[PDB]
Scaffold this motif. Structure first.
Motif, PDB file in Angstrom:
ATOM      1  N   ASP B  92       0.735  -1.296   0.057  1.00  0.00           N
ATOM      2  CA  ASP B  92      -0.098  -0.055  -0.174  1.00  0.00           C
ATOM      3  C   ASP B  92       0.763   1.210  -0.041  1.00  0.00           C
ATOM      4  N   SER B  93       0.290   2.444  -0.279  1.00  0.00           N
ATOM      5  CA  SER B  93       0.942   3.644  -0.368  1.00  0.00           C
ATOM      6  C   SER B  93       1.514   4.185   0.900  1.00  0.00           C
ATOM      7  N   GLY B  94       1.143   3.818   1.910  1.00  0.00           N
ATOM      8  CA  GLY B  94       1.253   4.279   3.427  1.00  0.00           C
ATOM      9  C   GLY B  94       0.377   5.546   4.131  1.00  0.00           C
ATOM     10  N   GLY B  95       0.029   6.060   3.005  1.00  0.00           N
ATOM     11  CA  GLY B  95      -1.189   7.161   3.346  1.00  0.00           C
ATOM     12  C   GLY B  95      -2.204   7.102   4.135  1.00  0.00           C
ATOM     13  N   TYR B  96      -2.865   5.932   4.008  1.00  0.00           N
ATOM     14  CA  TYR B  96      -4.061   5.612   4.918  1.00  0.00           C
ATOM     15  C   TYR B  96      -3.721   5.305   6.420  1.00  0.00           C
ATOM     16  N   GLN B  97      -2.770   4.460   6.745  1.00  0.00           N
ATOM     17  CA  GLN B  97      -2.248   4.163   7.919  1.00  0.00           C
ATOM     18  C   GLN B  97      -1.734   5.466   8.492  1.00  0.00           C
ATOM     19  N   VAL B  98      -1.109   6.514   7.920  1.00  0.00           N
ATOM     20  CA  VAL B  98      -0.681   7.631   8.321  1.00  0.00           C
ATOM     21  C   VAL B  98      -1.827   8.637   9.169  1.00  0.00           C
ATOM     22  N   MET B  99      -2.890   8.389   8.307  1.00  0.00           N
ATOM     23  CA  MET B  99      -4.143   9.167   8.867  1.00  0.00           C
ATOM     24  C   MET B  99      -4.748   8.478   9.909  1.00  0.00           C
ATOM     25  N   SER B 100      -4.447   7.350  10.124  1.00  0.00           N
ATOM     26  CA  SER B 100      -5.037   6.420  11.108  1.00  0.00           C
ATOM     27  C   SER B 100      -4.321   6.236  12.318  1.00  0.00           C
ATOM     28  N   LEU B 101      -2.874   5.847  12.167  1.00  0.00           N
ATOM     29  CA  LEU B 101      -1.999   5.355  13.375  1.00  0.00           C
ATOM     30  C   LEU B 101      -1.084   6.517  13.659  1.00  0.00           C
ATOM     31  N   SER B 102      -0.487   7.265  12.897  1.00  0.00           N
ATOM     32  CA  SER B 102       0.390   8.389  13.273  1.00  0.00           C
ATOM     33  C   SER B 102      -0.257   9.436  14.125  1.00  0.00           C
ATOM     34  N   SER B 103       0.563  10.505  14.637  1.00  0.00           N
ATOM     35  CA  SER B 103       0.324  11.655  15.200  1.00  0.00           C
ATOM     36  C   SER B 103       0.575  12.876  14.664  1.00  0.00           C
ATOM     37  N   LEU B 104       0.071  13.875  14.706  1.00  0.00           N
ATOM     38  CA  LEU B 104       0.306  15.335  14.487  1.00  0.00           C
ATOM     39  C   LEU B 104       0.363  15.311  12.899  1.00  0.00           C
ATOM     40  N   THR B 105      -0.500  14.877  12.183  1.00  0.00           N
ATOM     41  CA  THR B 105      -0.232  14.860  10.626  1.00  0.00           C
ATOM     42  C   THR B 105      -0.487  16.311   9.993  1.00  0.00           C
ATOM     43  N   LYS B 106       0.306  16.832   9.457  1.00  0.00           N
ATOM     44  CA  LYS B 106       0.077  18.086   8.839  1.00  0.00           C
ATOM     45  C   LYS B 106       0.280  17.675   7.114  1.00  0.00           C
ATOM     46  N   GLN B 107      -1.016  18.211   6.698  1.00  0.00           N
ATOM     47  CA  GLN B 107      -1.232  17.826   5.223  1.00  0.00           C
ATOM     48  C   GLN B 107      -1.156  18.982   4.476  1.00  0.00           C
ATOM     49  N   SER B 108      -0.629  18.998   3.041  1.00  0.00           N
ATOM     50  CA  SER B 108      -0.551  19.767   2.249  1.00  0.00           C
ATOM     51  C   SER B 108      -0.572  19.200   0.699  1.00  0.00           C
ATOM     52  N   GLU B 109      -0.503  20.005  -0.243  1.00  0.00           N
ATOM     53  CA  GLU B 109      -0.383  19.414  -1.702  1.00  0.00           C
ATOM     54  C   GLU B 109       0.866  18.717  -1.944  1.00  0.00           C
TER      55      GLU B 109
END
Ligand code: APQ
Ligand code: APQ
Ligand code: ZN
Ligand code: ZN
Lengths: 372, 372
Positions: B92-109
């Motif tokens: 998988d790309s890793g993006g999904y589990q980033v939004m689910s399992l990681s802390s302080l997610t800063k998103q951008s373009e």
């Protein structure tokens, strides 16, 4: 095969190598018995345990009488059927783990009353009940129920426990013999007590031989006395036991302890060291044990041990197992345990071969030089 | 074999059955992919995973980039070599589990910045970094890096995420193509977004097809919308994707969900359900799942499922596994997991055979009647 037949094929000094033939299989001695706590050798299918070279495993009576239950296991067809191991199984009496793991133990001449460390229930284990439980489990090698002596022990306390154990040995023998099916298909081992005192060990040996057993265990050791003291006690204790019967050193498993014990006449061993090793990350190698969790193994592509022939060492690297253990992955435990038990079986094979070839003393010397 | 070749051998309604040929092996579709979290399919050796019938497994990029590290795994020879699985691996790309399992997610373009839920470190995953990490892992099927839309989602938020995902799909495609070794030996799957909105799903499908991918995943489902809604979305969404390429439904694993999804055109599945089932004690049977911990199984001598052909069902009883699970024994997890994955593979085989024989609709009906 017969109910029980121990034959010594070769000797070197006090060391012996041979076989014990039983209905369920042949046991090559000196033998190492993997420990199956709650009807399972931790993290291994029975087929994998056999693949490592094990001819027999040990079953913990204390845990079994508690968790699934002796009667339940009997109703289900016996321990062999239950867990999927069709070869010999040696079961301990349960008395030791009662004094170690249970709560509020009330002791007497009749036996021991105690509370489960699980549900907090109560049980009354005795020479008769212990023998019965081992029968219900369908054990091949039954251990007499004794009273283990704490270390250090005074001569009077060691004498009292040893004397009670000998009375309990007679009760175990009679209980075993009165049960036709058990007497005809299983074997009974007596246990020598007496702490570190030679006169007591001699009295125990004579009492045990007088009753007569299929094998004799050296009990009361590996309880905090150290290797030097253990070896010193074995020096005079093993020769006291009948030469033509198996000698079993209970709860002894460090590789070096095994080598030294065989040099002193011990034919059988058991220990949780191999299984618990791959729990904290300890892996045995011919160059000594290593803790796989250490950072130096993070990118080590070599197998656990350079010459070990186990499936783990054929397929996976130290780096992978290091990762698995640090990640708390079940496969880490499975792999470490398989390797460790395989390492122990290879050790026993090298011991048996060296005795048969009259070069055991040289093997012990070479083993130690490299292991330490 | 070629880098990638999907061929459909048979059809029935929207359902298809065929094969995907890749350098490392052939994948029979519809396919179920066991999930390997930290470079390991929970409690199973790779050989056992293969024995159950699995042609391909999934690797979690999020966990891998954190725990052992993508660069480290590359230095060690790749994921296949590292874990001992030589067949195809979809990452998988890793993006999904980033939004689910990681802390302080800063998103951008540009992508996403986040803190590890392990050491508390920081990482900046992007379409380019994700593709690179999957390359370092040596992945066979690479997933484009997208932005998963939370359920429920408003039309404007669903549109914004879908639009960003399509821009990120183009970036993933270009990153993949610029890396010669990866473009020549691996495959790239695009992911359709758009939540439950048909117009958005259509825009996503067109954008993905315009870029061009080896396979197309239906993302944004199995996020709390329920089976009815999921099926309704699949009804109009799957037909929008290119017919001649694989259709992958991400994170869908309940047996009934799989059957219904195949009826709607899905060719690939993955889920932690099988592995996590044998963690809380859930075992799949043709008569529905059972919780092995329940007291009614304490003396049940029958295997987990009456017709399952897995090694677990051949050798052990429900009673034994019940004991193992309640005792917290590792073998309990090993046995439950092997059975569950084997059950899933048998389900996929029955699905493939029924489609090939033009009786899939009847199979789905019979499966449900008995399973519920
Ligand atoms: C896992 C338990 C099997 S071996 C236990 C053990 C270990 C040691 N070291 C001594 C004794 C003993 O004297 N008596 C008994 N029953 N058991 C002993
Ligand atoms: C164990 C993780 C593998 S599947 C994860 C998953 C599951 C579901 N249900 C949806 C998505 C999605 O939309 N995008 C991505 N990358 N992943 C998804
Ligand atoms: Zn090994
Ligand atoms: Zn099964």
């Amino acid at each position: 095969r017969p109910r029980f037949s121990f034959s010594i094929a070769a000797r070197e000094g006090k060391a012996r190598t041979g076989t014990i033939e039983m209905k369920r299989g042949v046991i090559r001695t000196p033998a190492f018995m993997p420990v199956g706590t709650a009807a399972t050798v931790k993290a291994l299918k029975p087929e994998t345990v056999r693949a490592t070279g094990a001819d027999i495993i040990l079953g913990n009576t204390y845990h079994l009488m508690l968790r699934p239950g002796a009667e339940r296991i009997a109703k289900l067809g016996g321990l062999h059927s239950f867990m999927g191991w069709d070869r010999p199984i040696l079961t301990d009496s349960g008395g030791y783990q009662v004094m170690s793991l249970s709560s509020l133990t009330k002791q007497s001449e009749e036996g021991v009353t105690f509370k489960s460390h699980l549900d907090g229930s109560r049980h009354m284990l005795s020479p008769e009940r212990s023998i019965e439980i081992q029968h219900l489990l369908g054990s091949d090698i039954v251990m007499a129920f004794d009273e283990c002596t704490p270390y250090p022990a005074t001569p009077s306390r060691a004498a009292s426990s040893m004397e009670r154990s000998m009375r309990w040995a007679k009760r175990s023998r009679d209980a075993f013999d009165s049960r036709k099916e058990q007497a005809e298909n299983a074997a009974l081992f007596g246990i020598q007590q007496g702490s570190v005192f030679e006169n007591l060990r001699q009295q125990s040996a004579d009492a045990l031989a007088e009753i007569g057993f299929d094998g004799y265990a050296v009990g009361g050791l590996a309880v905090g006395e150290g290797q030097d003291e253990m070896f010193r006690v074995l020096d005079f204790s093993v020769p006291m036991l009948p030469d033509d019967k198996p000698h079993y050193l209970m709860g002894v498993g460090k590789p070096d302890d095994i080598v030294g014990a065989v040099e002193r006449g011990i034919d059988m061993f058991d220990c949780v060291l191999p299984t618990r090793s791959g729990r904290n990350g300890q892996a045995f190698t011919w160059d000594g044990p290593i803790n796989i969790r250490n950072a130096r193994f993070s990118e080590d592509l070599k197998p656990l041990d350079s010459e070990c022939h186990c499936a783990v060492c054929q397929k996976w690297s130290r780096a992978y197992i290091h990762h698995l253990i640090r990640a708390g992955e079940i496969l880490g435990a499975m792999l470490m345990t398989e390797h460790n038990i395989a390492f122990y079986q290879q050790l026993m094979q090298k011991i048996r071969d060296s005795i048969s070839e009259g070069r055991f003393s040289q093997f012990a010397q070479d083993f130690r030089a490299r292991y330490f």
